[PDB]
Amino acid sequence: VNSFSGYLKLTDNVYIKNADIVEEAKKVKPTVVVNAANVYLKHGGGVAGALNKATNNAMQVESDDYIATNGPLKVGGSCVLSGHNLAKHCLHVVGPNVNKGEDIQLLKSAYENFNQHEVLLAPLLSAGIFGADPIHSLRVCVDTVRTNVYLAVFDKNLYDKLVSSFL
Ligand SMILES: O=C(N[C@@H]1c2cccc(O)c2C[C@@H]1C(=O)O)c1ccc(Nc2cccnc2)cc1
């Protein structure tokens, strides 16, 4: 039993809700919140900008030190940093950004990072301003992630479309 509330169950291990991931993180305080990161951990907009704003820019400060030490992430890769006031940990995961021409096959590699964590609160990778089809992202999530994932979808219209089209 965990504290995630109001989710629709899609599969044995994948759950989905129309929710603001920032508000959901603040209420649940999950062990792991996933950020829709880029390779530079520059959290300017979309989910990343929202999460970073909620940390009063502490996520960005920590991220800049991480990059200065380690260099950029790989597309499809991840790193674990602090969850600040939102979660114990933040798993920064880089899905391919279609508006940069990155290979969408890398989306499966991106979701594989979730398997290193037993339970996660997450957005749909590569959705939103990353330009991929969210229906496709949900399919890859279901077919790749084996650990317990609670997906937060900000847009109600998109949430309803994802549920209604789910196979
Ligand atoms: O980018 C965001 N979502 C994407 C989006 C947006 C629109 C249509 C879409 O299909 C998608 C897919 C993505 C998703 O749903 O994950 C997002 C989520 C929460 C948020 N929280 C917040 C907002 C304002 C101030 N502070 C915190 C901000 C942005």
From Swiss-Prot:
Q: What's the superkingdom here?
A: Viruses
Topology relative to the membrane? Multi-pass membrane protein
**Record text on activity regulation:** Inhibited in vitro by GRL-0617.
Q: Where is the Macro domain?
A: 1-167
The protein's location, in the record's own words, is: Host endoplasmic reticulum membrane
What chemistry does it catalyse, as a reaction equation? Thiol-dependent hydrolysis of ester, thioester, amide, peptide and isopeptide bonds formed by the C-terminal Gly of ubiquitin (a 76-residue protein attached to proteins as an intracellular targeting signal)
General function of this protein: Responsible for the cleavages located at the N-terminus of the replicase polyprotein. Participates together with nsp4 in the assembly of virally-induced cytoplasmic double-membrane vesicles necessary for viral replication. Antagonizes innate immune induction of type I interferon by blocking the phosphorylation, dimerization and subsequent nuclear translocation of host IRF3. Also prevents host NF-kappa-B signaling. In addition, PL-PRO possesses a deubiquitinating/deISGylating activity and processes both 'Lys-48'- and 'Lys-63'-linked polyubiquitin chains from cellular substrates.
Q: Give the multimer and partner information.
A: May form homohexamers. Interacts with N protein.
Question: Protein name, please?
Answer: Papain-like protease nsp3
The top of its lineage is: Viruses, Riboviria, Orthornavirae, Pisuviricota, Pisoniviricetes
Originating gene: rep
